[PDB]
UniProtKB/Swiss-Prot annotation:
<dbReference type="GO" id="GO:0015908">
    <property type="term" value="P:fatty acid transport"/>
</dbReference>
<dbReference type="InterPro" id="IPR000463">
    <property type="entry name" value="Fatty_acid-bd"/>
</dbReference>
<dbReference type="GO" id="GO:0016209">
    <property type="term" value="F:antioxidant activity"/>
</dbReference>
<dbReference type="GO" id="GO:0005829">
    <property type="term" value="C:cytosol"/>
</dbReference>
<keyword id="KW-0813">Transport</keyword>
<feature type="modified residue" description="N6-succinyllysine">
    <location>
        <position position="59"/>
    </location>
</feature>
<dbReference type="GO" id="GO:0070062">
    <property type="term" value="C:extracellular exosome"/>
</dbReference>
<dbReference type="GO" id="GO:0071456">
    <property type="term" value="P:cellular response to hypoxia"/>
</dbReference>
<protein>
    <recommendedName>
        <fullName>Fatty acid-binding protein, liver</fullName>
    </recommendedName>
</protein>
<dbReference type="GO" id="GO:0005504">
    <property type="term" value="F:fatty acid binding"/>
</dbReference>
<dbReference type="GO" id="GO:0005782">
    <property type="term" value="C:peroxisomal matrix"/>
</dbReference>
<feature type="modified residue" description="Phosphoserine">
    <location>
        <position position="102"/>
    </location>
</feature>
<feature type="modified residue" description="N6-succinyllysine">
    <location>
        <position position="92"/>
    </location>
</feature>
<comment type="function">
    <text>Plays a role in lipoprotein-mediated cholesterol uptake in hepatocytes. Binds cholesterol. Binds free fatty acids and their coenzyme A derivatives, bilirubin, and some other small molecules in the cytoplasm. May be involved in intracellular lipid transport.</text>
</comment>
<feature type="modified residue" description="N6-succinyllysine">
    <location>
        <position position="48"/>
    </location>
</feature>
<feature type="modified residue" description="Phosphoserine">
    <location>
        <position position="41"/>
    </location>
</feature>
<keyword id="KW-0007">Acetylation</keyword>
Amino acid sequence: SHMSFSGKYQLQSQENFEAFMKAIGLPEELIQKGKDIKGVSEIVQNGKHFKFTITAGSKVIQNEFTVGEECELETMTGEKVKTVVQLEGDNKLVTTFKNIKSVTELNGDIITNTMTLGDIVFKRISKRI
């Protein structure tokens, strides 16, 4: 039995925001302005179809995709990329784009996103509101 990812979540803590955002080329001014924002994200899941509205520092980023099909995503820099998101197990959405691996895992009321960019691990932990 798979879990639904639907909900609104607020950022609780995060590790390596600065390193990660600098590596992907976010303007320094947005790094400074964005690093202390604990924003609210929303996931709407209809079956295998998902709509995410994510607060990523100073930007709202909206994505939409169906598991196992090619999708266009906007990255945290608003670059557009083509990839595919898969469900791994009961509680994890996993995708790879550019040189980034992204795992989003729901445990109860806590959603953890880890993005690995070479040796940088950017982790964000958010809690259901």
